[model samples]
Target: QNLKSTDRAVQQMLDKAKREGIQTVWDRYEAMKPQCGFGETGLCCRHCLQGPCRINPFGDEPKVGICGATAEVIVARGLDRSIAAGAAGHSGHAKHLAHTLKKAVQGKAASYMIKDRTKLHSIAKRLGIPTEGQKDEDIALEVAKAALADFHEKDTPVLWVTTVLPPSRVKVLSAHGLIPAGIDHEIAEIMHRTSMGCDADAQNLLLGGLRCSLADLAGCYMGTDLADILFGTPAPVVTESNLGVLKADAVNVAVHGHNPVLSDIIVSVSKEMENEARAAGATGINVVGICCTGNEVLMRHGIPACTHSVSQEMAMITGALDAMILDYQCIQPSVATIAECTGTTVITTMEMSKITGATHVNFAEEAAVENAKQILRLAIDTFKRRKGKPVEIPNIKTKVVAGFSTEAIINALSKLNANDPLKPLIDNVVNGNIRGVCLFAGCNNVKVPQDQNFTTIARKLLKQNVLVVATGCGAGALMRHGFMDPANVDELCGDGLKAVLTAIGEANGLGGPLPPVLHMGSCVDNSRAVALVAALANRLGVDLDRLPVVASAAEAMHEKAVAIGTWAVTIGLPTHIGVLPPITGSLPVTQILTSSVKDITGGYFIVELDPETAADKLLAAINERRAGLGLPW
Candidate 1:
């Protein structure tokens, strides 16, 4: 009962797994009950060989580690390192995209080319690169080089961060020393300072973490921009989601993990191989997504997501998935073990992320198309083998209208006001037609029921007319619950929000409203939300901190979520996390995060675990911002 998910299809699979004695993520989480308090509280340190130390949280015994680090110091170090690791993860993903763009422009990657020249020109102009009288390829190459330069410390600050935010907000970041020197430099600095006998002042360490998170912001912004330049920027797409997207008679291949480099090719290759699958006695080749990679393809290709994050194993439990293809990040190693029982071929691409028991297809951009074909062929072969086997596929799915990139949103708004795209949106917010904007992001945590916190908080906020946007698994959570279905707008949105959505829809020639929640691509696409707010801030002649905007990672679990949340706070938004981060063990650290940090950045964390209370807190935060801006609550 305690370990159940909010998704009915997931609950059904969990029941099936239980009947078959198949262990899943929930079972593993239950097995890890009574988890280490020291680690949970960030009171433990293992940074050096001198001692793996723990401080007594009860205040009865040890107050410091063997190195004389206080609890605050230890927690701050741990938090900083988490932020650093998260920055590395995002920056590494961006670096891969930069390299892929470089290869595509250099004619080394045959299957890839500039798919969105408008985005290329926009990005180039934003970076102050000369785009006039230049070929798209040359402009792309220059953009790739500039992106690569942002990775290392240089004469200027990271261009992605400095150019993306409003000048006022940039000044705020600069004043607080939160402007990152470079993505890699800040990450390396965090690692160096967080080491034993290094930077020990808790507040100073947190400032360093905020700087590193700004690097993460740069990395994420660049990731979205480069990905759009290579693959076209996402627009509105009608699709379906959930496990029912897996067809029993089709070669169902689930694209898991982040990074669209290979997965986008796989989607293309799947269409080409559909006849081959039919010859193999299958109806067609079905490509679905799982996590952010799923989000990437879903936005651009209208692909359905089978599952996401904590409940990924449940997709296999449905017994209809022929192949689970992985790229990198948020992929459960346990999925390979489960594949052994489900007759599913777990295919791992990317040399760095191969699982022990899965098939490794070494993917290179040079041979991208051929590699995708090979992967699809393997899935077809797997389908032929499992053709007549009895399988249980859930009949649950939801109608979804996703793919709302910043450009797409602006395009829609432009319909309402041909000359001024953001005017309608800004007017609505100012008039309280839209109460505020709240961005739901991050992953599903097994600690909380899958989709529960997201659904609960979103339902409450939408009723209060708070415009919602989502990224990563948080998008998956809401879409799975019909929050991304335009048909549900009347039921899910308040009268004011419903009217605003309907007007925009009618202006765009859609008969109904836009979905109550906007899907803004993957985790890195949180950069799209940043761009939206920056536009609003610039138009209103105010800093981001003063805007009636807030964010939440209701079920945050990944280190990347930590990085994202830290950057959100650094950007002057009231960021909320449903799951408590490890810094709770240090009173001063907690105070700074939840309260005192507001003085520095006009942003702070609302660490509420209850979904209803979290919604109330976020609404209150929105009201507070509205009041500050002299607007009605």
Candidate 2:
């Protein structure tokens, strides 16, 4: 039926999986059809287990839990817990990077060094740390320490959140009591309040969730800043995507997951071990990315992305991948099972995340180079064993020009207006050469066709002149569909958007326009998108709520996506989600998220599953903001 994905390469792999009787995510989704209604509606409660309680959605009977918790409380608690989990995940990733930076500065991590000193000084100055007449190592250690301190319940609010936003937006958040005291503090508060015998007010619980989501923003901002400090911030780098990037005669190693601590080093070490790969009777080493890790290296090193999210197993099904290395999050454990069938060695790094049937290679940043070499050696050995095996690689790929970090975007704009870089973008919006901006973020869900929601909405927005920026699998989806290829600008973008892109590209000495879609970075780099909007808000002398900006995580599946969306709402942007979250059981909860909250934050959720309708809603939102700004819609 070609129901799983629109990509021809993915369809080819799915057909092969069916012929060989191998089950993919689509098969598992089918087996789980007509999923539990209680859980789906957020009406099921497992907390405190006096009874595994269920509130009937259709009738009034059993409307409360055994502890007398109402349907609204149940839904609010569940949603709050999801935000807490997502906040913990993003904060944990930032904490890892903070530790790495600390160790590198102290000379405990030999393989890691500060790669972007300008970003280091920039972050230090933003954090109010004195950087004058100090060694780079000293300044970096203080910056790392500051990042670590933000995790606890500090006397002041989280510096990352308070400092990153515009003054007006910060004041709005502060007045609403949404400013988080600390990242871990807010997460712990959510966990405490959502428990059985705790806060039961639906509105208050939702407020707790909003605060935790802000903590997620703090963690995400720190993650982006620290990553740029460690591995140089991404600039526009041309690359390729899809299963066609896999080479039959080369040692194909797919780097999967979110963190780049190990993957970045792997990219560097692979070059040194190229001859070693050739010595094993192979063409050379080919390291491609799978998900955010692919986004990480692709923007920095021009690495090709093999696949992402729900279709990750298809990469192994091509029979060309020798090893898949993983760090954490958005990685399916089923890849290990798929590896069993394809003879691809699935290697899990990190002590916290280990698969039962996969190889374990404990990766320590102190010896990152050696550890990467060891991992590559194992891949080369597997390549030797699988040499000359019958393989089917889909001959499909697209040109991708990605790595548009906020700094990179500024650098490009500076080429046009060196004195005031944001002028060109601001002038374009004022002059009606641009309508508004939209940031595409989040993961792929099996509920919809892979990449369907993303491509559908992006096509609509670009044609209407909405500037599109993407991160995570959302970026993967668009790049695979030629949205990130500069050559497709004329076909995909409206006259206004095409003209502005061409002007910027020509100013930068490029022969063509910039890609219709700008690849900002990985999921954590949602912070970069926020930074751009905040700058616009400040330059325009307006709060974030009045700006012509929006965000969407169509096909969202992860708790981290939930956290990101909540923070996007808290920061005052109309956000969209294609997949319905499990909060529909409570009328008040849904209403608060989709409508009432707009009064407080100038942001609300538009939960439309239909891509076309969702795009229409987002466009309406942009036009409304443009009207508020006295600009043409």
Candidate 3:
């Protein structure tokens, strides 16, 4: 059981959990012995009150549900709902950012201002919004309005979607009816279509899922754009990670969850409020991060990340965590319980995502500075209260060079050839110096021993010369296991890739090796990867499916991950999943996901439980793509 996670710090927490007689996610995973197979395979349905149905996947009983839905319908319905749920999560987050931008433009968000004017001008030009003779705030107002307008019906496709993707890809999506009309509408349509008795054709249901996936892509793009405008486009930055980032002598604050609105202010105010920490007898204020919130700050501010989702509770178990400031999405409410036991304060900032017994700091954009100072003060005060409490921080952390935005990557390549920045990378791939690129993303699942699949498959692929990029919890997982340490590039990367990285690093003035795996950004920022791929595809004069790129969520447990996987396949990348999605009961549904969808969308799914086999399959897919492009593997 100790083999579950690949992190030494996590192992220490597991031991602490046992010593304290506390139940963690791992313990509950054990208590759930022999979990139901029907639900695991998408053979169950409770979409309506008429009946909660389960099918006999082994054919011991009825093959249909109580509502006369066949195995195919049930499986397709489940998948469509899952994809739509993912779209909802991303769209919700996107809407919040857009709305916040509006407030910033209206002078309501006092702490918020347009941080990246260049991005604003670029977006305005791309979207065909006039900006001449306009104030930056005025331009931002139109941008916010334009982004919000995507939620409603328009004469054209979603502006964010059409502008970011290549015209060729847009034509393909339009041809297949996979192009979304609007983000909110597509999600709503999926919900209505998947309701009991609304739609039963498995093929049609899957198409609806793809359509919602396009909406997800839009939401992700808009989220990243808004963040860049509000926060600033990320650049190369050095950081560190793991529980060891927590300071025993200072007030330690960990920002968790997805939203950066509050987290950015917290990062800012923590510095201004250092006097508060010292006045309370603390050495200083140290703000680390966890989950996507960590990624947000780490990408832009070079803040050290504490952990991602699965290890969030384990971070508290480190006993050095003074407070966990949470906003929304992927935040486990059980963190409050962990905080209770560990003498840590849990501060829930979002009204919609508040946890009982946790401090509610109703964060207001109008009162941003005040809210941020108050929040940090709480952590500083909590630090004083923890003076005599038993505490132990895992002596584990790794140096990492993160903050790789698409522009930053291009800038590094520009060192090789300023006239053709992408040429060097393309030439490397064409000459087989780099075999391909694989994006490791999504959430962690207790069922698989946190991050085991991500690290195992990453190592296998790195040795085979694949360039790895990670985001969300998957990025945190790799960082925890020291995959982000630049020295690992020489140790793990194949000779070809190692040489390429060293040359690029030397050209960029980094007198050391680059990390084997590039840390992209948060879940919403997955769009950054899409942009890079699209740029490459356009430069190569081929559709995305022709590229030797792949995506995987080895231990995925989020519907957003499912949506992301769906889009990856839709855009012609071979996607791999370590955990079985709930569609095993229907052979047709499984066949469609793994086989038939490729014919229509140029991509498909490959499910493999073993990381080694999964790595082989992904590499083979890359090789096949390479062969199609007449490039060496």
Alpha carbon lDDT of each predicted model: 0.93, 0.93, 0.88
Query: Clashing pairs in model 3?
Result: 4-449, 42-582
Off by over 4 Å in 1: 1-3
lDDT of 2 at 108: 96
TM-scores for all candidates?
0.99, 0.99, 0.98
- List, residue by residue over 331-357, the lDDT tens digit for candidate 2: 899988988899999999899999999
Q: Which stretches of candidate 3 lie over 4 Å from their true place?
A: none
The alpha-carbon root-mean-square deviation between model 3 and the true structure, to one decimal in Å, is 1.1
lDDT of 3 by residue, 232-347 (tens): 99998888998888889989999988888888989998989888789898888899999888999999999999888776788888788898998988887888887878888999
| Poorest stretch of ten by lDDT in candidate 3 | 1-10
Kindly give the number of clashing pairs for every candidate. 0, 0, 2
Predicted candidate 1 versus true structure: per-residue lDDT over 1-633, tens digit per residue:
435798988988988999999998888888999899999999999999977899988967788899899999999999999999889989989999999999998999979999999999999999999998898899999999999999998898999999999888889889989898989999999999999899989899999999999999999999999999888999999999999999999999999988989789999989988789999999999999999999999999999988899999999998888999898899999989999999899999898888999999988899999988988899999989886798888899999999999999999999999899999998998888899999999999989988999999999999999999999999999999999999999899999999999999999999889999999999999999999998998989998899999999999999999999999999999999999789888999999999999998888999999999999999999999999999999
- Model 2 lDDT vs. the true structure? 0.93
lDDT, residue 359, model 3 = 92
Reference-based TM-score, model 2: 0.99
